[PDB]
Amino acid sequence: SGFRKMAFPSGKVEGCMVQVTCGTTTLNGLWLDDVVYCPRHVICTSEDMLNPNYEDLLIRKSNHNFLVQAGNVQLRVIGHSMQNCVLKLKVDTANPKTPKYKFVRIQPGQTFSVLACYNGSPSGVYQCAMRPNFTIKGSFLNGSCGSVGFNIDYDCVSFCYMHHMELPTGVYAGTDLEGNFYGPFVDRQTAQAAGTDTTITVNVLAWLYAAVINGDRWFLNRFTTTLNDFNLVAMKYNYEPLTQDHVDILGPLSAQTGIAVLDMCASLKELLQNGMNGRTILGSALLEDEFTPFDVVRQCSGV
Amino acid sequence: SGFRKMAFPSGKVEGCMVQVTCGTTTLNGLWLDDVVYCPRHVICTSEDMLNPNYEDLLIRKSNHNFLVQAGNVQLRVIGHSMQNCVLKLKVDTANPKTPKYKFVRIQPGQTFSVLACYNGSPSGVYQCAMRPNFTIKGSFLNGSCGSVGFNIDYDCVSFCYMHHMELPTGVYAGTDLEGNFYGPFVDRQTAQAAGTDTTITVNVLAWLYAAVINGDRWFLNRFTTTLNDFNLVAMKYNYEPLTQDHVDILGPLSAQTGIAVLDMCASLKELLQNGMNGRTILGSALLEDEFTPFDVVRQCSGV
Numbered sequence: 019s020g021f022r023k024m025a026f027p028s029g030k031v032e033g034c035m036v037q038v039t040c041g042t043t044t045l046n047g048l049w050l051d052d053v054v055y056c057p058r059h060v061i062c063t064s065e066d067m068l069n070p071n072y073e074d075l076l077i078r079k080s081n082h083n084f085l086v087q088a089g090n091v092q093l094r095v096i097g098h099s100m101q102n103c104v105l106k107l108k109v110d111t112a113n114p115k116t117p118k119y120k121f122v123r124i125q126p127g128q129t130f131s132v133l134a135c136y137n138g139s140p141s142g143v144y145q146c147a148m149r150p151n152f153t154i155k156g157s158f159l160n161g162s163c164g165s166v167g168f169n170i171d172y173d174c175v176s177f178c179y180m181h182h183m184e185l186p187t188g189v190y191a192g193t194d195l196e197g198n199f200y201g202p203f204v205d206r207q208t209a210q211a212a213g214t215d216t217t218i219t220v221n222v223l224a225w226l227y228a229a230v231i232n233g234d235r236w237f238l239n240r241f242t243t244t245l246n247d248f249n250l251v252a253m254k255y256n257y258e259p260l261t262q263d264h265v266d267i268l269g270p271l272s273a274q275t276g277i278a279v280l281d282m283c284a285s286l287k288e289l290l291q292n293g294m295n296g297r298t299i300l301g302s303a304l305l306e307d308e309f310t311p312f313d314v315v316r317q318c319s320g321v
Numbered sequence: 322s323g324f325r326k327m328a329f330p331s332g333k334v335e336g337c338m339v340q341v342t343c344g345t346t347t348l349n350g351l352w353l354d355d356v357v358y359c360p361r362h363v364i365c366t367s368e369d370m371l372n373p374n375y376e377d378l379l380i381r382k383s384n385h386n387f388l389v390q391a392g393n394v395q396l397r398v399i400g401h402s403m404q405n406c407v408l409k410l411k412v413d414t415a416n417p418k419t420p421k422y423k424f425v426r427i428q429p430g431q432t433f434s435v436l437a438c439y440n441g442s443p444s445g446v447y448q449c450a451m452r453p454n455f456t457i458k459g460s461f462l463n464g465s466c467g468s469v470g471f472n473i474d475y476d477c478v479s480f481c482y483m484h485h486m487e488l489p490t491g492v493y494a495g496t497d498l499e500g501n502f503y504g505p506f507v508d509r510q511t512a513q514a515a516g517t518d519t520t521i522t523v524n525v526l527a528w529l530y531a532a533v534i535n536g537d538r539w540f541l542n543r544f545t546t547t548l549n550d551f552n553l554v555a556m557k558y559n560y561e562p563l564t565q566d567h568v569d570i571l572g573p574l575s576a577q578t579g580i581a582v583l584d585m586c587a588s589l590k591e592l593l594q595n596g597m598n599g600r601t602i603l604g605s606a607l608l609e610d611e612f613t614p615f616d617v618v619r620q621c622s623g624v
């Protein structure tokens with residue numbers, strides 16, 4: 019037993035990390051096949067950031083205004099197409115190291131691994147979750163712009179996230195790789211509301227299931243409950259309501275623990291009402307909600 | 322702002338992960354240049370594990386009793402030397418992918434990244450700390466045997482850890498790459514005492530320094546203290562005593578925060594005495610002690 023936050027191996031993604039410079043500004047891009055993706059705001063001076071017009075800005079740019087470095091390798095840019103908030107750059111060479119990939123738009127509650135770069139170089143990797151309000155709570159400092167998040171699918175890298183901007187709050191926003199923001203955000207330096215966050219209920223249950231499996235079980239109740247019961251609790255404590263589908267996804271855990279979901283939903287109810295009273299679950303002393311049921315299953319079998 | 326547990330990029334290490342089979346038992350090895358390292362207990366049946374004689378066991382083995390798979394590549398073994406608890410295997414090919422490396426024995430309190438494998442394949446990466454009692458509190462399931470931990474040094478992979486065994490408790494023990502256990506442990510399936518753990522005080526301070534830097538500062542005291550004062554507190558709450566050297570290492574943080582160490586040692590003293598009263602520091606609601614001062618500095622500058 020023992021259970022920590024764990025990220026996919028990053029090697030496969032390290033191979034695609036390039037630096038992209040365009041005047042002053044210089045950030046990280048993702049170079050796949052013969053295309054290189056990055057946040058479109060590379061084309062700004064920090065003066066433009068205040069209220070850009072990305073077309074009128076972009077219009078005064080030619081391939082040659084774009085430096086793309088891969089370690090010590092240079093790529094001639096030969097084409098440049100803005101796609102929403104992402105910039106695409108056609109280049110002479112196709113990345114040798116391009117792995118099998120897709121682009122995907124993930125959903126609130128879903129986790130991914132993130133590789134944080136600084137000027138086309140990986141410094142570190144961590145796992146995180148898209149919040150219900152389409153933000154994340156990670157660790158990104160200047161130059162980390164254009165860092166990416168992804169899941170790995172045996173062989174296949176599903177890319178879900180490109181990092182753009184921090185919110186006054188210390189939470190992050192960013193796009194899918196088609197360049198559509200996750201959330202109601204825009205690439206402009208103006209007051210922008212995060213919006214009220216909720217707790218990812220399905221995950222929390224997942225986490226408890228993980229607990230039971232590792233030995234930590236003191237919180238196992240004497241009761242049960244129905245759905246409506248518990249949802250109507252959840253509401254109060256800003257938990258996301260639990261559908262049938264959340265139950266079905268948990269079933270695999272029902273199975274391994276031989277614990278019906280609703281008996282766990284009824285352990286949660288109490289913890290929610292009674293607090294945790296100083297004791298620890300899996301070491302943590304609050305309710306971790308950034309492991310999916312899928313996550314727990316990867317790590318409580320052996321993938 | 323925002324600050325999470327973050328692991329070095331693993332690519333460089335992924336290239337060295339091989340599977341090693343020897344009869345029944347099959348676990349992960351590390352293949353560097355023309356040598357392959359793994360826990361010596363591969364040579365056991367689970368019957369031997371009860372009380373092995375590793376020489377008399379090893380003596381009945383020939384190179385050919387050893388299957389070494391790298392994805393779908395086979396290595397002829399041509400030499401086999403037990404070195405304490407690790408096994409070394411000479412092989413025809415030198416790993417093409419061998420990066421710059423050293424082997425190092427780290428010290429209580431020091432962190433590293435860990436890449437967890439299953440049958441010569443990386444499933445995941447996480448960061449962790451060697452506890453004062455030479456254990457770790459990670460996430461290792463069967464087949465993860467021979468997984469490794471390491472720091473990366475711009476270009477250079479310092480290997481510090483090879484995983485051997487779990488303790489009834491759900492904490493792990495394992496060797497340096499010379500094959501000497503960290504701690505008073507042996508590769509045998511018998512009752513073995515973890516020993517009393519302490520909290521890594523220097524790190525905790527480091528963590529607070531990280532807090533202040535990210536905005537979280539409610540815990541900033543009205544007082545100060547001397548060393549003896551605080552150490553004599555630490556004792557009670559099972560904290561490691563703080564040397565001058567711990568102060569010197571923290572100084573860089575003193576500098577960036579313009580907060581004298583002892584003013585922080587005096588914020589800690591109170592938190593220790595007063596508890597945390599439900600509020601959160603950097604989200605966590607207890608005292609994280611698994612980031613080094615070095616760690617905080619990597620992430621609170623931009624390496």
Ligand SMILES: *C(=N)[C@H](C[C@@H]1CCNC1=O)NC(=O)[C@@H]1[C@H]2[C@@H](CN1C(=O)[C@@H](NC(=O)C(F)(F)F)C(C)(C)C)C2(C)C
Binds near residue numbers: 182206
């Ligand atoms: C580059 N990585 C950076 C993101 C953050 C700076 C500090 N740490 C980071 O990760 N990108 C930007 O500079 C980013 C985007 C918009 C401004 N911006 C911000 O992060 C700002 N935030 C906003 O303007 C927001 F809309 F989110 F409120 C700020 C004020 C620096 C936090 C542009 C420059 C295009």
Ligand SMILES: *C(=N)[C@H](C[C@@H]1CCNC1=O)NC(=O)[C@@H]1[C@H]2[C@@H](CN1C(=O)[C@@H](NC(=O)C(F)(F)F)C(C)(C)C)C2(C)C
Binds near residue numbers: 370461485486
């Ligand atoms: C292989 N990875 C495994 C380690 C742990 C099994 C479950 N999760 C793990 O990470 N290696 C072993 O089987 C390991 C070493 C010794 C037994 N052993 C154990 O982990 C056992 N523990 C002990 O015997 C200990 F001394 F630590 F108390 C146990 C009972 C499975 C927890 C050998 C087989 C050589």
